[PDB]
């Protein structure tokens, strides 16, 4: 997980999710693309 | 001239029931309503120098309304004086410890005026999570109201 203020989806296989009052970006292909909005 | 007469009934401490299951007010609004009663602002004989407020029995306090996510967010604080002893409890935790009646009492305490009579006023509030309570028998009642209530229920209440 890259915890950061900015949370953009990198590849096409990335998908944005809204859980626990935080924007997560998970990804099905590349595991490096996992991000979390703060 | 207006003041002269028998004042004993005016200064009589009545007992006011509030079935929280029936009442549609939220917690804080209910607490505010109670506070006035406890002070004795409702009655025209009131004076700031004299404590002349009524008893308030709250019942079925488990069914109290709380808006938003305050039940799992709202934190009640406490502190002895020794640093590193700030005790912060969420509303649900406080309820689990004591009850919804404790929560109501805290609200009512905060509503009340900060002086030597405050504690007395707080004491007059009698809160109960469920229905059954000892003060059942002493809530203000009238003979004209008796027809509304069924026959055996009254007897059962009296027995209780």
């Amino acid at each position: 997980f890259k915890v950061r203020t900015s949370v953009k989806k990198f590849c096409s296989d990335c998908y944005l999710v809204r859980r626990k009052g935080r924007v997560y970006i998970y990804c099905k292909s590349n595991k490096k693309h996992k991000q979390r909005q703060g | 001239s207006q003041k002269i007469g028998h004042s004993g009934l005016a200064f009589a401490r009545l007992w006011h029931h509030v079935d929280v299951a029936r009442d549609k007010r939220t917690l804080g609004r209910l607490a505010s309503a109670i506070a006035i009663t406890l002070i004795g602002r409702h009655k025209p004989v009131y004076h700031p120098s004299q404590d002349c407020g009524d008893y308030v029995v709250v019942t079925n306090c488990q069914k109290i309304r709380v808006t938003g996510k305050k039940f799992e967010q709202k934190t009640y604080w406490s502190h002895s004086g020794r640093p590193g002893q700030l005790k912060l409890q969420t509303m649900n935790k406080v309820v689990a410890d004591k009850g919804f009646g404790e929560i109501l009492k805290k609200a009512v305490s905060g509503m009340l005026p900060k002086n030597k009579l405050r504690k007395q006023r707080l004491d007059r509030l009698k809160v109960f999570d469920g229905s059954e309570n000892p003060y059942k028998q002493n809530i203000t009642a009238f003979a004209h109201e008796q027809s509304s209530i069924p026959e055996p229920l009254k007897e059962s209440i009296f027995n209780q």
Binding site: - | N60, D97, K98, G99, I139, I149
Partner: protein
């Protein structure tokens, strides 16, 4: 025939609902508690002496706890008292010493005027012993573990070196008039006062002390004593509770 009474509609017509159970209730607390499944017995710490294990040869210091007239006076129950416990009484006392009220209590419970009374809290109603019975050292098994409560030796008004193991100031190198007066209390300015629980000189000892997981080395009903491995809090002739260890089985 019937008495006059009026009843409010609001209290009569109120739909019946049971209150939810609260954590700060007795019954919840009882449920939470970590308790032994069996009663205990009061003893006196008579002294201390060596215990030689005859197989291995190992020597162990053992305290001799004497068991005299130890008797279940009465017991407490959840429905009446909020918890399950056995009121045990130790020893024998004169009439002269005991209060009239206490004598009457003992007569009611049908025991002799007692030297020391104490409760022994238990988990269930099964743990309660029938009242009036005599508890002997054979209660405990040899090799079993027990918790041990008693009031420690009084040490009097002690300093911070003895109380709290404070290092104190130096012996030489200029040190003036404060070699043992542990210094620096309530920080400075930031608190503006001595913060509560600041370790200071004061009275020490003569407080209760539980000692957990002590091994019952030896039990004998002949001499009326329980041998117990190691130390026990308090002076000689001090009363000592003994119950099964909650931690060790």
């Amino acid at each position: 025939s019937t008495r006059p009474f009026l009843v409010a509609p609001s209290i009569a017509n109120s739909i019946t609902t049971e209150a939810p159970a609260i954590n700060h209730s007795p019954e919840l607390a009882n449920a939470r508690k970590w308790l032994p499944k069996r009663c205990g017995l009061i003893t006196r710490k008579k002294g201390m002496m060596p215990y030689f294990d005859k197989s291995t040869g190992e020597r162990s210091a053992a305290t001799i706890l004497e068991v005299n007239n130890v008797e279940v006076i009465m017991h407490r129950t959840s429905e009446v008292n909020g918890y399950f416990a056995c009121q045990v009484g130790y020893g024998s006392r004169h009439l002269s010493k005991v209060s009239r009220q206490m004598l009457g209590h003992f007569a009611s419970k049908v025991v002799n005027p007692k030297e020391h009374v104490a409760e022994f809290r238990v988990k269930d109603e099964k743990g309660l012993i029938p009242p009036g019975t005599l508890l002997k050292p054979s209660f405990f098994k040899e090799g079993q573990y027990v918790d041990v409560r008693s009031v420690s030796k009084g040490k009097g008004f002690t300093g911070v070196m003895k109380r709290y193991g404070f290092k104190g100031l130096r012996a030489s190198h200029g040190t003036s008039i404060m070699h043992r007066h542990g210094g620096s209390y309530g920080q400075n300015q930031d608190p503006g006062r001595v913060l509560p629980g600041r370790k200071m000189p004061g009275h020490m000892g003569n407080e209760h002390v539980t000692i957990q997981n002590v091994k019952v080395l030896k039990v004998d009903d002949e001499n009326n004593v329980i041998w117990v491995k190691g130390s026990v809090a308090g002076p000689k002739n001090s009363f000592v509770k003994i119950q099964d260890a909650i931690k060790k089985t």
